[PDB]
Amino acid sequence: PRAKTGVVRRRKHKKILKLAKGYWGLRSKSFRKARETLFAAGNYAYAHRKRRKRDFRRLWIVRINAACRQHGLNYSTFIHGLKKAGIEVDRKNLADLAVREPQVFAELVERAKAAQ
Amino acid sequence: VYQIPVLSPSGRRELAADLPAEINPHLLWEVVRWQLAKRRRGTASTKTRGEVAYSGRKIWPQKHTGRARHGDIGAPIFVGGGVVFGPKPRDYSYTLPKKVRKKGLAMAVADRAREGKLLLVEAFAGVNGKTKEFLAWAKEAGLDGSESVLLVTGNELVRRAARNLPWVVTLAPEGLNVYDIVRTERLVMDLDAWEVFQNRIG
Amino acid sequence: MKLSDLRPNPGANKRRKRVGRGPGSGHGKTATRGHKGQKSRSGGLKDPRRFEGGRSTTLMRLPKRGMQGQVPGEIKRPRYQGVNLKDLARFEGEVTPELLVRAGLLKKGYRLKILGEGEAKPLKVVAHAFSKSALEKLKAAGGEPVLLE
Amino acid sequence: PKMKTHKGAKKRVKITASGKVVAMKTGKRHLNWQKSGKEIRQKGRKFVLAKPEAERIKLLLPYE
RNA sequence: GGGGGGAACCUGGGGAACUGAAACAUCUCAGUACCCAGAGGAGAGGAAAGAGAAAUCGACUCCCUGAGUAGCGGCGAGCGA
RNA sequence: CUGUUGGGAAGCAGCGCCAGAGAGGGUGAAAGCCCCGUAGGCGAAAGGUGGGGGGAUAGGUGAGGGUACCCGAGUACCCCGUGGUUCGUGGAGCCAUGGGGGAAUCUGGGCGGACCACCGCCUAAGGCUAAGUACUCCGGGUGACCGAUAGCGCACCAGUACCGUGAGGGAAAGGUGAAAAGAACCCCGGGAGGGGAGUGAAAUAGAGCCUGAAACCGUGGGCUUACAAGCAGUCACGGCCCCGAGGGGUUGUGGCGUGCCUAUUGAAGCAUGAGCCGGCGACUCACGGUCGUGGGCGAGCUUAAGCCGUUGAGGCGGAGGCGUAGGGAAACCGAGUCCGAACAGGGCGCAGCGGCCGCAAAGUCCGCGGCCGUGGACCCGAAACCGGGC
RNA sequence: GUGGAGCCUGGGAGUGAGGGCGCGAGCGAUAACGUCCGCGUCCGAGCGCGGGAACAACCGAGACCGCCAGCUAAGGCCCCC
RNA sequence: GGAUGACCCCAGGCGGUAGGGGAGCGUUCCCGAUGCCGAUGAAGGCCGACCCGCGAGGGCGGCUGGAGGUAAGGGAAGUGC
RNA sequence: GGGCCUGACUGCGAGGCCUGCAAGCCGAGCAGGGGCGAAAGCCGGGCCUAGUGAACCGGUGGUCCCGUGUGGAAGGGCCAU
Ligand SMILES: [Mg+2]
Ligand SMILES: [Mg+2]
Ligand SMILES: [Mg+2]
Ligand SMILES: [Mg+2]
Ligand SMILES: [Mg+2]
Ligand SMILES: [Mg+2]
Ligand SMILES: [Mg+2]
Ligand SMILES: [Mg+2]
Ligand SMILES: [Mg+2]
Ligand SMILES: [Mg+2]
Ligand SMILES: [Mg+2]
Ligand SMILES: [Mg+2]
Ligand SMILES: [Mg+2]
Ligand SMILES: [Mg+2]
Ligand SMILES: [Mg+2]
Ligand SMILES: [Mg+2]
Ligand SMILES: [Mg+2]
Ligand SMILES: [Mg+2]
Ligand SMILES: [Mg+2]
Ligand SMILES: [Mg+2]
Ligand SMILES: [Mg+2]
Ligand SMILES: [Mg+2]
Ligand SMILES: [Mg+2]
Ligand SMILES: [Mg+2]
Ligand SMILES: [Mg+2]
Ligand SMILES: [Mg+2]
Ligand SMILES: [Mg+2]
Ligand SMILES: [Mg+2]
Ligand SMILES: [Mg+2]
Ligand SMILES: [Mg+2]
Ligand SMILES: [Mg+2]
Ligand SMILES: [Mg+2]
Ligand SMILES: [Mg+2]
Ligand SMILES: [Mg+2]
Ligand SMILES: [Mg+2]
Ligand SMILES: [Mg+2]
Ligand SMILES: [Mg+2]
Ligand SMILES: [Mg+2]
Ligand SMILES: [Mg+2]
Ligand SMILES: [Mg+2]
Ligand SMILES: [Mg+2]
Ligand SMILES: [Mg+2]
Ligand SMILES: [Mg+2]
Ligand SMILES: [Mg+2]
Ligand SMILES: [Mg+2]
Ligand SMILES: [Mg+2]
Ligand SMILES: [Mg+2]
Ligand SMILES: [Mg+2]
Ligand SMILES: [Mg+2]
Ligand SMILES: [Mg+2]
Ligand SMILES: [Mg+2]
Ligand SMILES: [Mg+2]
Ligand SMILES: [Mg+2]
Ligand SMILES: [Mg+2]
Ligand SMILES: [Mg+2]
Ligand SMILES: [Mg+2]
Ligand SMILES: [Mg+2]
Ligand SMILES: [Mg+2]
Ligand SMILES: [Mg+2]
Ligand SMILES: [Mg+2]
Ligand SMILES: [Mg+2]
Ligand SMILES: [Mg+2]
Ligand SMILES: [Mg+2]
Ligand SMILES: [Mg+2]
Ligand SMILES: [Mg+2]
Ligand SMILES: [Mg+2]
Ligand SMILES: [Mg+2]
Ligand SMILES: [Mg+2]
Ligand SMILES: [Mg+2]
Ligand SMILES: [Mg+2]
Ligand SMILES: [Mg+2]
Ligand SMILES: [Mg+2]
Ligand SMILES: [Mg+2]
Ligand SMILES: [Mg+2]
Ligand SMILES: [Mg+2]
Ligand SMILES: [Mg+2]
Ligand SMILES: [Mg+2]
Ligand SMILES: [Mg+2]
Ligand SMILES: [Mg+2]
Ligand SMILES: [Mg+2]
Ligand SMILES: [Mg+2]
Ligand SMILES: [Mg+2]
Ligand SMILES: [Mg+2]
Ligand SMILES: [Mg+2]
Ligand SMILES: [Mg+2]
Ligand SMILES: [Mg+2]
Ligand SMILES: [Mg+2]
Ligand SMILES: [Mg+2]
Ligand SMILES: [Mg+2]
Ligand SMILES: [Mg+2]
Ligand SMILES: [Mg+2]
Ligand SMILES: [Mg+2]
Ligand SMILES: [Mg+2]
Ligand SMILES: [Mg+2]
Ligand SMILES: [Mg+2]
Ligand SMILES: [Mg+2]
Ligand SMILES: [Mg+2]
Ligand SMILES: [Mg+2]
Ligand SMILES: [Mg+2]
Ligand SMILES: [Mg+2]
Ligand SMILES: [Mg+2]
Ligand SMILES: [Mg+2]
Ligand SMILES: [Mg+2]
Ligand SMILES: [Mg+2]
Ligand SMILES: [Mg+2]
Ligand SMILES: [Mg+2]
Ligand SMILES: [Mg+2]
Ligand SMILES: [Mg+2]
Ligand SMILES: [Mg+2]
Ligand SMILES: [Mg+2]
Ligand SMILES: [Mg+2]
Ligand SMILES: [Mg+2]
Ligand SMILES: [Mg+2]
Ligand SMILES: [Mg+2]
Ligand SMILES: [Mg+2]
Ligand SMILES: [Mg+2]
Ligand SMILES: [Mg+2]
Ligand SMILES: [Mg+2]
Ligand SMILES: [Mg+2]
Ligand SMILES: [Mg+2]
Ligand SMILES: [Mg+2]
Ligand SMILES: [Mg+2]
Ligand SMILES: [Mg+2]
Ligand SMILES: [Mg+2]
Ligand SMILES: [Mg+2]
Ligand SMILES: [Mg+2]
Ligand SMILES: [Mg+2]
Ligand SMILES: [Mg+2]
Ligand SMILES: [Mg+2]
Ligand SMILES: [Mg+2]
Ligand SMILES: [Mg+2]
Ligand SMILES: [Mg+2]
Ligand SMILES: [Mg+2]
Ligand SMILES: [Mg+2]
Ligand SMILES: [Mg+2]
Ligand SMILES: [Mg+2]
Ligand SMILES: [Mg+2]
Ligand SMILES: [Mg+2]
Ligand SMILES: [Mg+2]
Ligand SMILES: [Mg+2]
Ligand SMILES: [Mg+2]
Ligand SMILES: [Mg+2]
Ligand SMILES: [Mg+2]
Ligand SMILES: [Mg+2]
Ligand SMILES: [Mg+2]
Ligand SMILES: [Mg+2]
Ligand SMILES: [Mg+2]
Ligand SMILES: [Mg+2]
Ligand SMILES: [Mg+2]
Ligand SMILES: [Mg+2]
Ligand SMILES: [Mg+2]
Ligand SMILES: [Mg+2]
Ligand SMILES: [Mg+2]
Ligand SMILES: [Mg+2]
Ligand SMILES: [Mg+2]
Ligand SMILES: [Mg+2]
Ligand SMILES: [Mg+2]
Ligand SMILES: [Mg+2]
Ligand SMILES: [Mg+2]
Ligand SMILES: [Mg+2]
Ligand SMILES: [Mg+2]
Ligand SMILES: [Mg+2]
Ligand SMILES: [Mg+2]
Ligand SMILES: [Mg+2]
Ligand SMILES: [Mg+2]
Ligand SMILES: [Mg+2]
Ligand SMILES: [Mg+2]
Ligand SMILES: [Mg+2]
Ligand SMILES: [Mg+2]
Ligand SMILES: [Mg+2]
Ligand SMILES: [Mg+2]
Ligand SMILES: [Mg+2]
Ligand SMILES: [Mg+2]
Ligand SMILES: [Mg+2]
Ligand SMILES: [Mg+2]
Ligand SMILES: [Mg+2]
Ligand SMILES: [Mg+2]
Ligand SMILES: [Mg+2]
Ligand SMILES: [Mg+2]
Ligand SMILES: [Mg+2]
Ligand SMILES: [Mg+2]
Ligand SMILES: [Mg+2]
Ligand SMILES: [Mg+2]
Ligand SMILES: [Mg+2]
Ligand SMILES: [Mg+2]
Ligand SMILES: [Mg+2]
Ligand SMILES: [Mg+2]
Ligand SMILES: [Mg+2]
Ligand SMILES: [Mg+2]
Ligand SMILES: [Mg+2]
Ligand SMILES: [Mg+2]
Ligand SMILES: [Mg+2]
Ligand SMILES: [Mg+2]
Ligand SMILES: [Mg+2]
Ligand SMILES: [Mg+2]
Ligand SMILES: [Mg+2]
Ligand SMILES: [Mg+2]
Ligand SMILES: [Mg+2]
Ligand SMILES: [Mg+2]
Ligand SMILES: [Mg+2]
Ligand SMILES: [Mg+2]
Ligand SMILES: [Mg+2]
Ligand SMILES: [Mg+2]
Ligand SMILES: [Mg+2]
Ligand SMILES: [Mg+2]
Ligand SMILES: [Mg+2]
Ligand SMILES: [Mg+2]
Ligand SMILES: [Mg+2]
Ligand SMILES: [Mg+2]
Ligand SMILES: [Mg+2]
Ligand SMILES: [Mg+2]
Ligand SMILES: [Mg+2]
Ligand SMILES: [Mg+2]
Ligand SMILES: [Mg+2]
Ligand SMILES: [Mg+2]
Ligand SMILES: [Mg+2]
Ligand SMILES: [Mg+2]
Ligand SMILES: [Mg+2]
Ligand SMILES: [Mg+2]
Ligand SMILES: [Mg+2]
Ligand SMILES: [Mg+2]
Ligand SMILES: [Mg+2]
Ligand SMILES: [Mg+2]
Ligand SMILES: [Mg+2]
Ligand SMILES: [Mg+2]
Ligand SMILES: [Mg+2]
Ligand SMILES: [Mg+2]
Ligand SMILES: [Mg+2]
Ligand SMILES: [Mg+2]
Ligand SMILES: [Mg+2]
Ligand SMILES: [Mg+2]
Ligand SMILES: [Mg+2]
Ligand SMILES: [Mg+2]
Ligand SMILES: [Mg+2]
Ligand SMILES: [Mg+2]
Ligand SMILES: [Mg+2]
Ligand SMILES: [Mg+2]
Ligand SMILES: [Mg+2]
Ligand SMILES: [Mg+2]
Ligand SMILES: [Mg+2]
Ligand SMILES: [Mg+2]
Ligand SMILES: [Mg+2]
Ligand SMILES: [Mg+2]
Ligand SMILES: [Mg+2]
Ligand SMILES: [Mg+2]
Ligand SMILES: [Mg+2]
Ligand SMILES: [Mg+2]
Ligand SMILES: [Mg+2]
Ligand SMILES: [Mg+2]
Ligand SMILES: [Mg+2]
Ligand SMILES: [Mg+2]
Ligand SMILES: [Mg+2]
Ligand SMILES: [Mg+2]
Ligand SMILES: [Mg+2]
Ligand SMILES: [Mg+2]
Ligand SMILES: [Mg+2]
Ligand SMILES: [Mg+2]
Ligand SMILES: [Mg+2]
Ligand SMILES: [Mg+2]
Ligand SMILES: [Mg+2]
Ligand SMILES: [Mg+2]
Ligand SMILES: [Mg+2]
Ligand SMILES: [Mg+2]
Ligand SMILES: [Mg+2]
Ligand SMILES: [Mg+2]
Ligand SMILES: [Mg+2]
Ligand SMILES: [Mg+2]
Ligand SMILES: [Mg+2]
Ligand SMILES: [Mg+2]
Ligand SMILES: [Mg+2]
Ligand SMILES: [Mg+2]
Ligand SMILES: [Mg+2]
Ligand SMILES: [Mg+2]
Ligand SMILES: [Mg+2]
Ligand SMILES: [Mg+2]
Ligand SMILES: [Mg+2]
Ligand SMILES: [Mg+2]
Ligand SMILES: [Mg+2]
Ligand SMILES: [Mg+2]
Ligand SMILES: [Mg+2]
Ligand SMILES: [Mg+2]
Ligand SMILES: [Mg+2]
Ligand SMILES: [Mg+2]
Ligand SMILES: [Mg+2]
Ligand SMILES: [Mg+2]
Ligand SMILES: [Mg+2]
């Protein structure tokens, strides 16, 4: 019996091209260029999930800092103080406080100055 | 060992014979595989690059043309060239061990016995070649045709009657074989047949 | 039991190894052959059972031994296959070369020579030869050695 | 086609009862005048081949 | 009566090389490819100046086995009743 | 046969019927019973054949005793040079024969691997001879054979078109619809083409005609873009648009970010290959071998060709092969043997599980898988060599 | 010392062009991104990740997947960051 | 743990070229099949932000298309660009 | 330096060095028949590590193993070189 390619290959190229929808020039039109683009997009993705966790933390840090220097100390001193106090509210949440609940944040500032 | 129903005008008596009780599912497969493989024709063919019609000339020079190097157009790399490792004629047959066939034949029948599906008949009433006669006799023995039957007898006129039916397969006893046994839901054997089946298994 | 219930045992029918079929197969590109070299080529290497890269071969540095014989070839003489007494225990009455042909103990066109491993059984055994120990054992055990030529 | 026995192997070598491979020792075909009697005598015996080179030779005798 | 043709098949008269021997010359490929002559629905062969050890067999052809045996071989590659 | 759906019944429903026929192809779809067939049967005046049946004809047929007439000549035979055989000059016979020499007719002559003797076999130098075997131009049957890049080079007006002085090379190209019902007629246009009308179940089935993918070109719509630095993405956020605590599209800003493959010590690499898309394209099969594995039997296992049966039915067939014993160059001996003076010393060899039963197993057979050997042996690619022709 | 430790019998391989760095030598000129050995290491195959502006082999560290959570390593904490 | 792939709990391993091993997905064809899905629409084609699967894929649904397709379990290869 | 001597042995070899193979090396001890020594003992060349060449083909002395129907022979095998 003979098994020609038939239907199988087209269906594999289509799978890829759909995944490539939105890319520039031949990168969404040619099967071959899509596949090249998708290898990049896949390693970029994986890496950027990892990197996103960093990126946000760095924003949280910058934010805590501004609201700390409004009460006369820096992020480095702040984090030390909370640490001695045993306050374990994460930087994600500290940041929401520093903008949404500035009284409550000032209190946290109070405790950190006390703890050293 | 096994108790087998026997139909007669004197009534439904019972017959006693020793077919193996524990039945080997792999062994029956090995018989059927063999049966069905040796029936193969092996008539698929293709042409190699030496059996193809074109000539051996080098279509263009080796270097300096700016094209890929090629030889002749019989090369399988060309559309229209010969095919690589395609089929040639083949003989799929092989000699399955005789004892294996024998056990397979025993077990096949034994299985249908354990199922209550094996039936031996003494004779076939008024069936003398006409299919409607068999259908009559069929009914008298419980064969409506809700179950497929392998009929094994040496009486030609019975075989010729029962043959055209969708639900009946017909055999002379020397033709008894396990693929035909497994195919069908019920086994129906003349006594004459059961005797020769006996000879082949001992 | 029906046709759809026919199955090979686990392990009985195994799938083949197919190389040269994509990255993820673990057999792609070079098709488990490595890179370049004579071995990777269609046609492969010289018969590794003998060839050793050009230096004199292991086999060919060993000396020949004994009679190899000449044209017109083999010298037709009578041949002896031995069979042990223990092999003979299955029979009763008389045993002769043809009997031990049938029982599939002695190969055709071979002359019978009884050997001594096992016990002797009080049979009348007919051969072309007996070993010393087979002769004793068998005479001792009430059997009757009978010599053919 | 069925394989052919390598005759140069058949003439040099023997497959023992357990499948070892045995050959005459090399080195007294000639140049023997200055060799000791110990050299000569020992070299008259058979030896057993190393597993790898022996396994190669058995394959060249597939009908022994 | 002959002549000439016919896809393969057959016999006979001629008869390579690449290649293999990890070089090459005996050897191999191989009496192959090919050329030529003749046959025919086939052709060849065929009623023992045989076999070769059986005190045996009994024209020839063809299949299986004998057997990759016996042997042949820069006793190499291989060849092979 | 009726009903029902449908353009169309063979679908579904209802009530039947045939079958030595329920192989298969068709008919508006999917039909045992509508058609063509199938099972089972019947058929040649004429020509071909006629291996079988019958008949003729040629041809075939005694025993002793005597005789020593005949029994295939440039032959046997010997030597020289070769070929054939498994035999390559080897102890080299046999068969054949180019050269030289050169018999005999049974008390003759050849052979049994130089030669000799003994013992056997056979009748050279004339011719013929069915069947069993080979092939497939041709006809038929059947496919775990192809399905228009496949299958023959050709499904089609192909050894054509075309290329070549010639030998020679050698393509492409199948599909409306159930039915042509192949679109009267009017309209714009020189025509082509189209718009209506019409046919059709369907006309993006309209003949440049089944399905109609992708590259590729176009129109329309949303989002977006003219201070911006880029392997073109990705992650985050925000704006706009769509669908209705959510998703989809787009992308302004910010973060990160050196194509793919091949080859390499190391390539984004200014090293190889690739314009893009589609289809073709590379680890196979036979026979041996060696491991592993699934089973059958087990001191046993197994048949090959063939023969019989089937016409997708299997059986017979024991010739032979492997195993049951090894050691030795061999004679030979044998659970031993070889070396040796040895009873020395060494090499290579020798010795299941449970209660007679089970269970296992030597070995062997078959299937399957990995790898090896021989084949072109994973696919493509030389420059060359040789033969016959042009 | 129970480790993707070790040993024995078999099946299947690939590799047999290495390269940088540290240390110990020879060669060279107490030259080479030089060459040849020894012990080690990494790259090779970790051209995945952090640091070193950028950079296979220097420092940190051996990436199963997900998280808008936490602690550190080298290196950093004036702005780019 | 239960008793042998029923699932649960706990613990450890899980970068990777050459390459070894294991388990699967799909394509053509055969048995299953005188069967079954199919004009109330076969295959194929175009969509989907839906479902199942780690993945190869498999479903489902809308449009196109107009006559084929083929299960559970097995068999065999001209089987994936 | 001297005396007597030929162990510059025949048949074997427990066990090891080295080592991919094949080779290379060292060797106590048993037996045959010897040499020197009162004896214990030593002696299978040389204080040691270089002075060498696997197989194929053949020569030579012996052995009396095979001897192509049989008795021989031809030719081979084995030991030595
Ligand atoms: Mg295709
Ligand atoms: Mg393909
Ligand atoms: Mg496709
Ligand atoms: Mg694909
Ligand atoms: Mg598709
Ligand atoms: Mg797909
Ligand atoms: Mg886009
Ligand atoms: Mg685009
Ligand atoms: Mg574009
Ligand atoms: Mg496009
Ligand atoms: Mg991640
Ligand atoms: Mg990252
Ligand atoms: Mg982190
Ligand atoms: Mg401050
Ligand atoms: Mg801290
Ligand atoms: Mg903290
Ligand atoms: Mg077949
Ligand atoms: Mg086939
Ligand atoms: Mg063909
Ligand atoms: Mg072909
Ligand atoms: Mg050709
Ligand atoms: Mg051709
Ligand atoms: Mg042609
Ligand atoms: Mg041609
Ligand atoms: Mg050609
Ligand atoms: Mg040519
Ligand atoms: Mg040509
Ligand atoms: Mg060029
Ligand atoms: Mg170009
Ligand atoms: Mg080109
Ligand atoms: Mg080209
Ligand atoms: Mg070319
Ligand atoms: Mg070509
Ligand atoms: Mg060519
Ligand atoms: Mg060609
Ligand atoms: Mg070709
Ligand atoms: Mg073709
Ligand atoms: Mg063509
Ligand atoms: Mg073709
Ligand atoms: Mg092909
Ligand atoms: Mg090929
Ligand atoms: Mg090819
Ligand atoms: Mg093939
Ligand atoms: Mg065939
Ligand atoms: Mg096979
Ligand atoms: Mg067969
Ligand atoms: Mg049925
Ligand atoms: Mg039927
Ligand atoms: Mg298979
Ligand atoms: Mg596998
Ligand atoms: Mg491949
Ligand atoms: Mg793959
Ligand atoms: Mg693998
Ligand atoms: Mg790999
Ligand atoms: Mg390769
Ligand atoms: Mg390989
Ligand atoms: Mg390679
Ligand atoms: Mg390499
Ligand atoms: Mg390569
Ligand atoms: Mg290389
Ligand atoms: Mg290699
Ligand atoms: Mg190379
Ligand atoms: Mg190659
Ligand atoms: Mg090739
Ligand atoms: Mg090669
Ligand atoms: Mg050399
Ligand atoms: Mg021999
Ligand atoms: Mg002869
Ligand atoms: Mg008695
Ligand atoms: Mg030697
Ligand atoms: Mg030599
Ligand atoms: Mg010698
Ligand atoms: Mg010699
Ligand atoms: Mg010396
Ligand atoms: Mg000596
Ligand atoms: Mg000496
Ligand atoms: Mg000696
Ligand atoms: Mg044999
Ligand atoms: Mg044997
Ligand atoms: Mg003529
Ligand atoms: Mg003629
Ligand atoms: Mg000829
Ligand atoms: Mg002539
Ligand atoms: Mg000739
Ligand atoms: Mg010539
Ligand atoms: Mg030549
Ligand atoms: Mg060749
Ligand atoms: Mg070769
Ligand atoms: Mg060559
Ligand atoms: Mg060569
Ligand atoms: Mg040359
Ligand atoms: Mg040559
Ligand atoms: Mg060849
Ligand atoms: Mg020849
Ligand atoms: Mg000829
Ligand atoms: Mg030919
Ligand atoms: Mg003629
Ligand atoms: Mg004929
Ligand atoms: Mg004739
Ligand atoms: Mg005659
Ligand atoms: Mg034999
Ligand atoms: Mg040789
Ligand atoms: Mg030849
Ligand atoms: Mg209607
Ligand atoms: Mg109707
Ligand atoms: Mg009905
Ligand atoms: Mg029928
Ligand atoms: Mg039908
Ligand atoms: Mg039909
Ligand atoms: Mg229609
Ligand atoms: Mg139907
Ligand atoms: Mg149908
Ligand atoms: Mg019909
Ligand atoms: Mg008929
Ligand atoms: Mg008929
Ligand atoms: Mg007379
Ligand atoms: Mg006379
Ligand atoms: Mg005469
Ligand atoms: Mg004459
Ligand atoms: Mg003569
Ligand atoms: Mg002559
Ligand atoms: Mg010759
Ligand atoms: Mg010779
Ligand atoms: Mg000769
Ligand atoms: Mg003579
Ligand atoms: Mg002559
Ligand atoms: Mg002459
Ligand atoms: Mg005379
Ligand atoms: Mg005479
Ligand atoms: Mg003569
Ligand atoms: Mg003769
Ligand atoms: Mg003779
Ligand atoms: Mg004769
Ligand atoms: Mg004639
Ligand atoms: Mg006749
Ligand atoms: Mg004839
Ligand atoms: Mg004939
Ligand atoms: Mg035909
Ligand atoms: Mg078809
Ligand atoms: Mg076409
Ligand atoms: Mg074509
Ligand atoms: Mg088409
Ligand atoms: Mg044709
Ligand atoms: Mg044309
Ligand atoms: Mg020209
Ligand atoms: Mg022209
Ligand atoms: Mg041409
Ligand atoms: Mg073409
Ligand atoms: Mg064409
Ligand atoms: Mg049509
Ligand atoms: Mg039509
Ligand atoms: Mg008009
Ligand atoms: Mg007008
Ligand atoms: Mg018009
Ligand atoms: Mg218009
Ligand atoms: Mg119009
Ligand atoms: Mg209408
Ligand atoms: Mg409709
Ligand atoms: Mg349409
Ligand atoms: Mg249409
Ligand atoms: Mg068109
Ligand atoms: Mg149609
Ligand atoms: Mg169309
Ligand atoms: Mg179109
Ligand atoms: Mg389009
Ligand atoms: Mg636009
Ligand atoms: Mg500016
Ligand atoms: Mg702007
Ligand atoms: Mg920049
Ligand atoms: Mg942000
Ligand atoms: Mg967004
Ligand atoms: Mg959104
Ligand atoms: Mg960006
Ligand atoms: Mg980077
Ligand atoms: Mg870049
Ligand atoms: Mg880089
Ligand atoms: Mg790629
Ligand atoms: Mg690649
Ligand atoms: Mg490349
Ligand atoms: Mg390169
Ligand atoms: Mg390079
Ligand atoms: Mg380089
Ligand atoms: Mg670049
Ligand atoms: Mg560039
Ligand atoms: Mg370049
Ligand atoms: Mg480039
Ligand atoms: Mg290059
Ligand atoms: Mg181009
Ligand atoms: Mg493009
Ligand atoms: Mg493509
Ligand atoms: Mg393979
Ligand atoms: Mg097996
Ligand atoms: Mg069996
Ligand atoms: Mg054999
Ligand atoms: Mg011994
Ligand atoms: Mg021993
Ligand atoms: Mg058993
Ligand atoms: Mg077994
Ligand atoms: Mg195998
Ligand atoms: Mg493999
Ligand atoms: Mg192998
Ligand atoms: Mg070939
Ligand atoms: Mg090939
Ligand atoms: Mg191969
Ligand atoms: Mg070529
Ligand atoms: Mg030229
Ligand atoms: Mg030349
Ligand atoms: Mg020339
Ligand atoms: Mg020429
Ligand atoms: Mg010429
Ligand atoms: Mg490990
Ligand atoms: Mg390891
Ligand atoms: Mg362990
Ligand atoms: Mg493998
Ligand atoms: Mg491999
Ligand atoms: Mg290798
Ligand atoms: Mg390598
Ligand atoms: Mg180098
Ligand atoms: Mg190197
Ligand atoms: Mg190095
Ligand atoms: Mg290294
Ligand atoms: Mg560097
Ligand atoms: Mg330092
Ligand atoms: Mg240094
Ligand atoms: Mg140094
Ligand atoms: Mg200086
Ligand atoms: Mg360097
Ligand atoms: Mg340096
Ligand atoms: Mg240096
Ligand atoms: Mg290093
Ligand atoms: Mg590399
Ligand atoms: Mg690293
Ligand atoms: Mg590493
Ligand atoms: Mg940085
Ligand atoms: Mg870095
Ligand atoms: Mg960095
Ligand atoms: Mg790195
Ligand atoms: Mg890890
Ligand atoms: Mg979450
Ligand atoms: Mg911290
Ligand atoms: Mg630090
Ligand atoms: Mg800095
Ligand atoms: Mg800062
Ligand atoms: Mg875990
Ligand atoms: Mg693990
Ligand atoms: Mg891994
Ligand atoms: Mg595994
Ligand atoms: Mg597929
Ligand atoms: Mg599959
Ligand atoms: Mg097909
Ligand atoms: Mg088919
Ligand atoms: Mg069917
Ligand atoms: Mg059907
Ligand atoms: Mg239906
Ligand atoms: Mg309809
Ligand atoms: Mg529809
Ligand atoms: Mg399908
Ligand atoms: Mg299909
Ligand atoms: Mg899908
Ligand atoms: Mg559809
Ligand atoms: Mg149809
Ligand atoms: Mg199917
Ligand atoms: Mg299935
Ligand atoms: Mg089946
Ligand atoms: Mg293919
Ligand atoms: Mg004295
Ligand atoms: Mg030793
Ligand atoms: Mg050694
Ligand atoms: Mg040395
Ligand atoms: Mg003494
Ligand atoms: Mg004394
Ligand atoms: Mg001593
Ligand atoms: Mg000295
Ligand atoms: Mg010295
Ligand atoms: Mg030496
Ligand atoms: Mg030689
Ligand atoms: Mg040589
Ligand atoms: Mg010699
Ligand atoms: Mg003798
Ligand atoms: Mg003689
Ligand atoms: Mg005499
Ligand atoms: Mg004699
Ligand atoms: Mg004499
Ligand atoms: Mg002699
Ligand atoms: Mg002699
Ligand atoms: Mg010697």
Curated annotation (Swiss-Prot), chain A:
Keywords: Ribonucleoprotein, Ribosomal protein, RNA-binding, rRNA-binding. PROSITE patterns: RIBOSOMAL_L20. One of its GO terms (molecular function) is structural constituent of ribosome. The keyword Cell inner membrane does not apply. The keyword Ribonucleoprotein applies. Signal peptide: none annotated. Disulfide bonds: none annotated. GO terms for cellular component: ribonucleoprotein complex; ribosome. GO terms for biological process: ribosomal large subunit assembly; translation. NCBIfam families: rplT_bact. HAMAP family: Ribosomal_bL20 (MF_00382). Belongs to the bacterial ribosomal protein bL20 family. PANTHER family: 39S RIBOSOMAL PROTEIN L20. Binds directly to 23S ribosomal RNA and is necessary for the in vitro assembly process of the 50S ribosomal subunit. It is not involved in the protein synthesizing functions of that subunit. This is Large ribosomal subunit protein bL20. The lineage of its organism: Bacteria, Thermotogati, Deinococcota, Deinococci, Thermales.
Swiss-Prot record, chain B:
One of the primary rRNA binding proteins, this protein initially binds near the 5'-end of the 23S rRNA. It is important during the early stages of 50S assembly. It makes multiple contacts with different domains of the 23S rRNA in the assembled 50S subunit and ribosome. Disulfide bonds: none annotated. HAMAP family: Ribosomal_uL4_B. Belongs to the universal ribosomal protein uL4 family. GO terms for cellular component: ribonucleoprotein complex; ribosome. One of its GO terms (molecular function) is rRNA binding. One of its GO terms (biological process) is translation. The lineage of its organism: Bacteria, Thermotogati, Deinococcota, Deinococci, Thermales. This is Large ribosomal subunit protein uL4. Part of the 50S ribosomal subunit. Keywords: Ribonucleoprotein, Ribosomal protein, RNA-binding, rRNA-binding. It comes from Thermus thermophilus (strain ATCC 27634 / DSM 579 / HB8).
From Swiss-Prot, chain C:
Belongs to the universal ribosomal protein uL15 family. Residues 30-39 have a biased composition (Basic residues). This is Large ribosomal subunit protein uL15. It comes from Thermus thermophilus (strain ATCC 27634 / DSM 579 / HB8). Keywords: Ribonucleoprotein, Ribosomal protein, RNA-binding, rRNA-binding. Residues 44-53 have a biased composition (Basic and acidic residues). Part of the 50S ribosomal subunit. SUPFAM superfamilies: Ribosomal proteins L15p and L18e (SSF52080). GO terms for molecular function: rRNA binding; structural constituent of ribosome. Residues 1-60 are annotated as: Disordered. One of its GO terms (cellular component) is cytosolic large ribosomal subunit. Binds to the 23S rRNA. PROSITE patterns: RIBOSOMAL_L15. GO terms for biological process: translation. It holds the Pfam family Ribosomal_L27A. InterPro entries: Ribosomal_uL15, Ribosomal_uL15/eL18, Ribosomal_uL15/eL18_sf, Ribosomal_uL15_bac-type, Ribosomal_uL15_CS. The lineage of its organism: Bacteria, Thermotogati, Deinococcota, Deinococci, Thermales.
UniProtKB/Swiss-Prot annotation, chain D:
SUPFAM superfamilies: L35p-like (SSF143034). GO terms for molecular function: structural constituent of ribosome. One of its GO terms (biological process) is translation. Pfam families: Ribosomal_L35p. Keywords: Ribonucleoprotein, Ribosomal protein. PROSITE patterns: RIBOSOMAL_L35 (PS00936). GO terms for cellular component: cytosolic large ribosomal subunit. Belongs to the bacterial ribosomal protein bL35 family. Part of the 50S ribosomal subunit. This is Large ribosomal subunit protein bL35. The lineage of its organism: Bacteria, Thermotogati, Deinococcota, Deinococci, Thermales. The gene is rpmI.
